[PDB]
Nucleic acid binder design. Structure first.
Lengths: 43, 103, 93, 119, 89
RNA sequence: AGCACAGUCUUAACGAUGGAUGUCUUGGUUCCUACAGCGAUGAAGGCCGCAGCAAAAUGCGAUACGCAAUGAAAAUUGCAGUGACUGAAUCAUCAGAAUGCUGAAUGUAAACUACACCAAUUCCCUGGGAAUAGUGGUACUCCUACAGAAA
RNA sequence: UUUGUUUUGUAGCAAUAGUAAUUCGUAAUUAUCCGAAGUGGUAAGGACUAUCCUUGAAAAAAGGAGGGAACGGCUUUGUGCUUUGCUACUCUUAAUACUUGUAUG
RNA sequence: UUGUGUUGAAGCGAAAUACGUGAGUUUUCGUGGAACAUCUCCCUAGUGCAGAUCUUGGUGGAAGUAGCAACUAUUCAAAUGAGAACUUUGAAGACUGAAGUGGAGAAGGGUUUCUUGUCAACUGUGAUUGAACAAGAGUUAGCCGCUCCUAAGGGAUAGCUGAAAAGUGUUUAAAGGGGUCCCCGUCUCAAAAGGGAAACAGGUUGAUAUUCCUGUGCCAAUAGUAUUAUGAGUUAGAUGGUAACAUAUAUAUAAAUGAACUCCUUUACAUAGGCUUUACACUCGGGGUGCGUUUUCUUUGCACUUUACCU
RNA sequence: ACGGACCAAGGAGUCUAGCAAAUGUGCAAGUGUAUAUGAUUCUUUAAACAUUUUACGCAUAAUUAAUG
RNA sequence: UAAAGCUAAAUAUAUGUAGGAGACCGAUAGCAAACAAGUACCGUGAGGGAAAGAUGAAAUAGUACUCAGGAAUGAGCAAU
RNA sequence: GAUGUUAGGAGGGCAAAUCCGCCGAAUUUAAGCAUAUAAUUAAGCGGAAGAAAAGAAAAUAACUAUGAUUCCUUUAGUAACGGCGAGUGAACAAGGACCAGCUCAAACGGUUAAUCCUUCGUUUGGUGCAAACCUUUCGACGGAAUUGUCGUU
């Protein structure tokens, strides 16, 4: 909802931050990805 | 078998009394030296309805004697008591309707 | 118990992270005389006011604050009309 | 890029204001990185490690003076007294563990276990 | 009827009963009775049961950082006196 | 430039699909040996962070994929960059320093970054000179000593 | 210093805004924004009437009252109390200056 | 024990004028690219599969089959593009029909939002679309909420039970505050629809707005001392009205003495019925302005004609 | 009558205790050196080797509730 | 010689840590996990819980060039 | 007794394979089942260590006697228990591993608590680079203790 608690919002931001791909420069020397509609955070 | 309805009552979960709008316990004045040896008069200020019970309740205001001030008591009203009446409670209170006397 | 190390309370270098330079923050400078800074989430209005005062010699009328989903705090600091945000932004880049 | 040993001789001032200018230049580097300018981004590592070295020397100096201040005095603060394991701290001292009554002591002194040879 | 035994009543499934439990960080904190179903947070103890080897082993010691005991490991074979340093070169 | 009916089924060769077999194995398993408690000096666990470009795992804690010191000792690199000609690059060790918010969690609370009260507090020079709303303390039970009231 | 007759102002906010138009380098000028009613849809308020073997929360917070404890200013006797010469003297709102740790949100 | 391997081991595919009766054994060709036997004798076992609605994995016929059917409905032209029934634009025909696929919120979700790219997969047809993928960005409050209060109620304290774990929560309690000795008093949580300090309009962005900008307000707080200034009152607290009651307009109606101790009020409350007032809504006529119809009729049909909080 | 669409891989009388029979082996009125000890063996070796002329089991004698 | 008390060794160790081994298993086996495994994912919750190893000596040899294609791809007189 | 945010301290929680207390099933077997068995087990609650617990006889024996505890071999599937059914089931001696004994209470000491702790000091020598640590005996101060510390045995 629009109403949130600080900890809940920070957790949502952390999940968004972790949902990003592997950096390209790293890959030239990810499995734990989620979509907002398929697998729910439950947290 | 299973626990019967009568047995479930004593658990007191949903069988507690619905007492949300009750106005207070109906008790007459705690024994004082004024009651024991003489009389004390308090005036009935309102006659109200207690949702649980059918009997009306009289709000009797007494004047405190150990300190300056007033105390309010919830009495079960006897039929005939009216607002503005003065009730007398004690050993020396006269025998009239509304008064509290030793039996 | 006594502490010998120097304080780990956040001073200005760490209270204020860096200025925001997105298109919105950029245009706010000219239009509404406001600088957009990015701060640690533990800053407050007073912290930001004092910190920008001691980081750049500018006071402000007001600071508005939001918490982003990226884990930091965005401060819209509206500069006093006595000076302008353009020269401060030119001084800092 | 500074080493710990040369600034070990500095006063706490030369330590703290050097830290202040180091932090200031780190903030300038971070501002440049916040802008598009990324030419000097690799200097952030070096500045950060310099800040760590300066803080290390300053804090070690402060801890040493704070230890000198409580030299002996039998009532050092908890962070100064020994950080042994809690069980070790609560253990009886070796003297208490080996302490014996006068009766036992005068028995053991007069009749000690002794070396001998069996032919 | 329409919000029936299955699909219909599943539509009324909003309003959680558990949340995050600041102690174990797992969404098992019953909001109405203020108690974690996983760790029993308001109580001092940890709420373990010998009838779940799996549950014991997925949150025993060594599942996390061991931020302190891993440091004090290996001290036994070094026996350095507290406060001591190596002799300078 | 011409010729085979089609389908169904059988055989061979070569392919497709699939991942068996064989061969590998920085893993497991079992035995043997040795040592063995951590925590209010704040543990285990949980969150939150930290890299120039950085998601996870691993590592670490506002000094944050690492500081110092000690041994080795020239590399480290995907790019950028940093390195001596050895407290410098990188390994190992790891005693010094540092160790966010929590958590028994302990000022009151908790799906609050909510609210108290008491000391203002911290740093710098050799009594001054600065900067800070920041920092400490305050649980319950109990022991020893003390204090001042009570019968 | 009263009672009648007029002018102004959308009562201030307020036209400077908004809307709909006409133009002009492509930002500006222009003109309007006022005369009378009907239905009862929604909401709220009012004064009422009726119903209950049903009578339909609490506290934070705020206010009113009863009561009448205390009492001017400058100086002075002696021991807060009698005292001596003199009168321009208390509360309230705002601003300023200095101390207060940095004295708005 | 005694052997084979990069001049190609194990394995695998097809085989053989091969041996055996048979489980099998042994060879050839191909493939393969690194190990393999030992039948000399013996030791050892997790040692032999067609089945167990066996376990796991893979794959069939069914079969290009069932099917891709609620929500009345599409059409013409253009743009983009490799490609357009389902992307965009214009035109038309229609639908939803203020009980709305229209506006605002809650629960829940959590970046799906926005801009720019963009098509491997997904978007059960297509797809240049997209809630997909990629890079950046975006959420601004003294006045909107939480935060405070208390409710149904929860947790805890004192005890008291119980081996404890726990159960109950004033049941022998010496359990912060007020004035200056006395008086009062368990703590804590529980409402984003109850109670409650105070905001409006205009504008603004790609994405936020009672939050930004402009203007105008409002609420709460504002320490001590001293100067001023505003006002009252006084030679220790004002005055009018018969009364109901009224009076401080200073930038601002700020001040009309008042302790302990008390007693009230507000907060603060159901349902039904009609009657009534006001605002908003709708509608009618006039005036002005613009547009429309105009074979014919039509002093015509439509749109605008506005005004917040605060004082 | 039930199970089996197809293929691969996996898939079921085993291990320990105790008793007996059978057979092989050693010794024989005996037999087994248990725990443990020693000892220039201490990769293997956690195995091998050893045991100053009443340890114990079974056997060498049966029978009876039993004194025996 | 009860109704008081202390006491090392010989003993045990499906835990943790660290060494060493084996007629053990050899990726459907062996721990659930040889790998980013108590992970992904599921359940309101207590809990449940996988799959997934191998190019080559060397990618410090990971496919350059041309042609055809919008591209994916394909082919080559081209190439490790 | 009460009260103290007076000074100095302690407990709390995690972890459990081995260990110490408590509490405590049923499946199962008996070819049914109820005593019995499963089992003084699982689950539940609490508490410790590198081991724990037990331990120096109110013990065995009946001998020519042994001599704290624990563990191994054995006693011994024995004595015994048991719908005497299913089942259950020790001890002493013997051989070994290891080997260790002690102190309170009570008695005795009043020509003198001879005890103990807190705080504050002095020096006695040592290994550290430092940080720190080990030794040290001369006090003083404030208490505790005769409702009994210490010495003797």
């Amino acid at each position: 909802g629009s109403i949130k608690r600080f900890r809940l919002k920070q957790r949502l931001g952390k999940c968004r931050r972790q949902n990003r791909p592997v950096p390209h420069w790293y890959r030239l020397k990810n499995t734990k990805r989620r979509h907002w509609r398929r697998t729910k955070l439950g947290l | 078998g299973r626990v019967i309805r009568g047995q479930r009552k004593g658990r007191g979960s949903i069988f507690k009394s619905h007492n949300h709008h009750r106005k207070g316990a109906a008790k007459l004045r705690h024994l004082d030296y004024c009651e024991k040896k003489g009389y004390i008069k308090g005036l009935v200020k309102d006659i109200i309805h207690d949702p649980g019970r059918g009997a009306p309740l009289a709000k009797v205001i007494f004047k405190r004697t150990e300190k300056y001030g007033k105390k309010e008591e919830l009495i079960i009203a006897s039929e005939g008591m009216f607002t503005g009446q003065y009730i007398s409670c004690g050993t020396k209170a006269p025998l009239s309707v509304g008064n509290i006397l030793p039996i | 118990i006594v502490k010998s190390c120097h304080s780990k309370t956040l001073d200005k270098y760490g209270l204020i992270k860096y200025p925001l330079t997105s298109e919105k923050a950029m245009k706010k400078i000219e239009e509404i005389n406001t600088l957009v800074f990015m701060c640690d989430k533990r800053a407050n209005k007073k912290n930001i006011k004092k910190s920008v005062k001691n980081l750049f010699g500018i006071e402000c009328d007001k600071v508005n604050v939001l918490n982003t989903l990226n884990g930091d705090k965005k401060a819209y600091v509206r500069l006093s009309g006595e000076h302008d945000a353009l020269e401060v932004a030119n001084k800092i880049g | 890029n500074v080493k710990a040993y040369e600034l070990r001789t500095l006063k706490k001032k030369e330590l703290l204001d050097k830290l202040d200018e180091l932090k200031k230049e780190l903030s300038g580097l971070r501002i440049s990185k916040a802008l598009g300018n990324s030419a000097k981004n690799s200097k952030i590592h070096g500045v950060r490690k310099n800040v760590a070295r300066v803080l290390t020397v300053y804090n070690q100096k402060r801890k040493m003076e704070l230890r000198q201040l409580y030299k002996n005095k039998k009532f050092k603060p908890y962070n100064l007294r020994k950080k042994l394991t809690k069980n070790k701290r609560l253990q009886l001292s070796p003297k208490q563990k080996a302490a014996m009554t006068l009766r036992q002591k005068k028995k053991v002194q007069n009749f000690p276990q002794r070396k001998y040879l069996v032919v | 009827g329409k919000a029936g035994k299955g699909t219909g009543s599943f539509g009324k499934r909003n309003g959680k009963t558990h949340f995050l439990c600041l102690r174990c960080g797992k969404r098992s904190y019953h909001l109405q009775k203020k108690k974690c179903a996983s760790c029993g947070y308001p109580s001092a103890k940890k709420r373990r049961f010998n009838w779940s080897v799996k549950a014991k082993r997925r949150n025993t010691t060594g599942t996390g950082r061991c931020r302190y005991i891993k440091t004090l490991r290996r001290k036994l074979k070094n026996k350095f006196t507290e406060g001591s340093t190596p002799k300078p070169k």
